[PDB]
Each structure stands twice: as structure tokens, then as C-alpha cells.
Design a protein around this ligand. Sequence first.
Ligand SMILES: O=C(O)CNC(=O)c1cccc2c1-c1ccccc1C2=O
Length: 291
Amino acid sequence: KVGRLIYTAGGYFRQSLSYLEAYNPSNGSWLRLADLQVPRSGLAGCVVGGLLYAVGGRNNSPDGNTDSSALDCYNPMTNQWSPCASMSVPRNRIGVGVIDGHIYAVGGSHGCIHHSSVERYEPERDEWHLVAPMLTRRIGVGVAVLNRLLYAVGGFDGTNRLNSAECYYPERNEWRMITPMNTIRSGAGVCVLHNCIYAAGGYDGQDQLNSVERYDVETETWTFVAPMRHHRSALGITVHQGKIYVLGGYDGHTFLDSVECYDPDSDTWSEVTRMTSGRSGVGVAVTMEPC
Ligand SMILES: O=C(O)CNC(=O)c1cccc2c1-c1ccccc1C2=O
């Protein structure tokens, strides 16, 4: 369990960013690691087999906006990125979850197209294949996995921001709606902790949110927990050692550098560190420290 860092890849501040930086909760330090090959915001991160994957996003630059179909892999042992097979379609504002060593890429946008499509990557074969699409088109969708079921939460369908959510049952290759959230949220941070799917922050169509709610997969209810100190949309999120970490985002005024940590035992958030610069739209995951 020792030696794991919170990695943050990419993001947005004025333009899309190539940064890869890693935070060590055990000593408060940050390390700057190898830049992404292509800057990207609105991507997702995940880890399989100790390797960090950066999935989708968009490169916003002075010279254009390019939605990404890319999958790239970072090996902490070498501090190098390597390209993997690309997805079937570009997916900005994507959601990603891992089931049994396979990466699921969910939703996202390609220009004015809002995807319902979903595809699954097999690292051993370096191949993607499409699976059943969601029941709803969703960009800015939060995704998490609990008990080998994949959840897609909230987002924006091209016309409305969503409080709806749905679950994918892999053995049936089928999606079903679950109870909707109490709050409409696009660009929330979605993760799993214990028996619940958390949705933190986001944008409800009027304001960036500090509220946080959790879906108990047994009781099928959404319950609010303590709110974050800061309102934030387009935040990064992960779980490490039984606590939720939220990173950056936009509060309606500033691109935040603050990282807050949720302790479920006390139902409290605390500010634990700051990123080296404020940014939104990062991908985040946890794996072993580099070199
Ligand atoms: O739709 C979503 O999911 C979240 N949107 C927002 O919260 C949002 C709303 C109005 C203006 C802006 C943003 C925003 C979010 C992230 C980076 C920059 C901006 C930005 O200028």
C-alpha cells in the first residue's frame, strides 16, 4: 500500500495543458513528471497494471480546438509516455472506468456531437471495441465502478444538464437507469468510496456547486454529505486510503489550485495541499511513485 501518488494529467488554464504532476499525501510534496505528448483538457485518467492512462479530451490552443480520440500510457518506471490504440471517435469531456483490467470510455463530445456511445479497451491486445451505448447522450459525465458495475452520472445531453444516472451490467451488455441525483450536475467529480458512488461539485446550469451527494448501490438513494469548502466544476477526483481527493476546477471566478480531502468517518472536508497552478479539466488517478 505504501509509495502511491495522486497523479494529475493535463487540464486547462487559458489553453489546454500538458502537465503531469504527482502529489505524495505522505509528505506533501509535488513532482513534475514527463509532459503529455499532446496538451489536453477534459480528459480522464485511470490506472491498469500500474500504468497510468490518459483518455480522450481536447487540445484547446490559440491555433485551434482538436477533440482527442487518444489513449496514451505513462509508465512510472521509465517516466515516459507511449501511445496506445486510439478510440473509435474523439471524446472530449469523457468519463472513464475500469472493470477487471479493461478501460471503458463513456460519452463525451466531438464538436457539436454529444455521444451516447461507449467502448472498451483491452490492454493485453491493445484494442478497443464498442459496447452497448448509454440510454442518454452525456458529455461532462462522471463515471465510476463499484462491484464490477459501471455508473454514468449526470452530464449534458446537448440541450439539458442532467440529474439522471445509469448503470452498465457487463454480462448483459445493457444499461439501465438508476435513481436520479437530487441535483443537476455537469462536470462533477464522480468516484466510489465504500458502498457508494459520490458526485461532488459540477455545474447545475446556473452555478458551480459545492454540494456532494452519494448513491448507495444497495438502497438506491442519493444522500447529501458535507459540502466542499469551494464550489467547483470541471474538478479532478480520486480516492486514496479511504478518502476522496478533489483537485482544482473552476469556481465561477478562479481556476482553483486547492485540493480538498473528504473523510467519510467524520463527514468533513479539509484543504490538504495546493496544485502548482490553478487549472480545471484534469485527469486524475493513483499509482506507484516513479523511477
Ligand atoms: O458545463 C460544465 O460542465 C461546467 N461549466 C462551467 O462550470 C462553466 C460555466 C460558465 C463558464 C465557464 C465554465 C467553465 C468550466 C471550466 C472551465 C472554464 C469555464 C468557463 O469559462
